[PDB]
Write a protein that binds this ligand. Structure first.
Ligand SMILES: Nc1ncnc2c1ncn2[C@@H]1O[C@H](C[C@@H](N)CC[C@H](N)C(=O)O)[C@@H](O)[C@H]1O
Ligand SMILES: Nc1ncnc2c1ncn2[C@@H]1O[C@H](C[C@@H](N)CC[C@H](N)C(=O)O)[C@@H](O)[C@H]1O
Lengths: 204, 204
């Protein structure tokens, strides 16, 4: 099996820090940080530029969950969040295609309510890698070594940034497995495209 | 330069027959049929089971538009709809990631408002195929002949149903080019997954 991880993902409950600046409305009734609705209240938020984009996770998961490699039960799926929660997504999860419905599911999971298909734990990215015994880790990034996807089969673990803008940073000395930075294209792609390219390279 | 077509797509202004059963609301203000909001009003609509799913198109287009093969300007992109409209999607279209905003864009286009990146014409699928001079056509369907994605490069035109349930029906006698039915996997996949698999085959 392969592990696929969307890491430092822009999927969080609204940070206490800024709840005071959030005026609630009926157009958006979720406690999930979303820049489309909280852009102002996020102005002085640390790393604001990489937070508040849950649709990156939604769209990527729609791609991952439906991929042949996942239908063949050959994937382990994890969402690691900006604030160090890890969601293990059961391969048979039926993810709502509706964005708001999606937010509703995630809101409950992140608040610790039980979900037999999506397990949540508090955990750093590095600890996750060690506990699943990731051995050869490909960190996907447009600034890594250009690499043909037919070579991706050589790694057992793939990490894709689940965030809008930035670069994925990981503490080498805290990870037992070997980490390699890998680009599969010379332009910046969206996260779900990268997830798709990985999944399909694993089947074909 | 390849043609990719999402065909008989579940993307329509509310059908004349059931307009009287559907009121704009604050929850969903768009004149686009969506069964997540209009399920009951669609009870007695013909082919209801393959209509009212704009999200299939939204997600597929997000995959297509961000694919390397499209960044390299090697795609022509078409949405053919259930009611015989054809939307030509400029490769540089920046499609809203937000579903409702996507609906707002598509609603205007379908109503005939000028959009310089998305052109709309009344047109059947067969007519579309003839106009673009499709010669070697792969119709994707799980029931077709299984074909490793590696071979997709031999065709010039790909057709994927932009609908939830059923099978694409095409009058071959009305089509100049050659049509083969092709399966890329031994299981029903979602349309966006098939689009993605095709797009990535074309680049690797
Ligand atoms: N050309 C690429 N090769 C490998 N991974 C990529 C590529 N483009 C985007 N990604 C992944 O997509 C994630 C989220 C992106 N919105 C950020 C892209 C950013 N330009 C980057 O390469 O880090 C990134 O953190 C990367 O992991
Ligand atoms: N295993 C598959 N191999 C090739 N194309 C597929 C496959 N599964 C779905 N598609 C395409 O995706 C479209 C949308 C589907 N939701 C329809 C599912 C239906 N089971 C079918 O294969 O036709 C279909 O019209 C096909 O064009």
């Amino acid at each position: 099996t392969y592990n696929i991880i969307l890491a430092k993902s822009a999927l969080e409950l609204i940070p206490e820090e800024i709840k005071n600046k959030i005026r609630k409305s009926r157009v958006y009734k979720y406690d999930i940080l979303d820049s489309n609705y909280h852009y102002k209240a996020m102005e002085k938020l640390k790393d604001k530029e990489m937070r508040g984009r849950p649709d990156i996770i939604h769209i990527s998961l729609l791609n991952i969950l439906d991929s042949p490699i996942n239908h063949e039960k050959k994937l382990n799926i994890y969402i690691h969040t900006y604030d160090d929660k890890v969601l293990k997504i059961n391969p048979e999860t039926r993810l709502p295609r509706n964005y708001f419905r999606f937010l509703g599911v995630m809101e409950k999971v992140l608040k610790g309510e039980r979900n037999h298909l999506i397990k949540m734990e508090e955990k750093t990215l590095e600890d996750l890698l060690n506990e699943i015994n990731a051995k050869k880790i490909a960190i996907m990034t447009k600034t890594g070594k250009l690499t043909h996807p037919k070579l991706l089969k050589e790694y057992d673990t793939f990490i894709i940034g689940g965030f809008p803008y930035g670069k994925l940073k990981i503490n080498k000395e805290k990870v037992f497995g070997d980490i390699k930075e890998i680009s599969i294209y010379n332009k910046g792609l969206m996260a779900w495209t990268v997830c798709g390219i990985i999944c399909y390279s694993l089947s074909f």
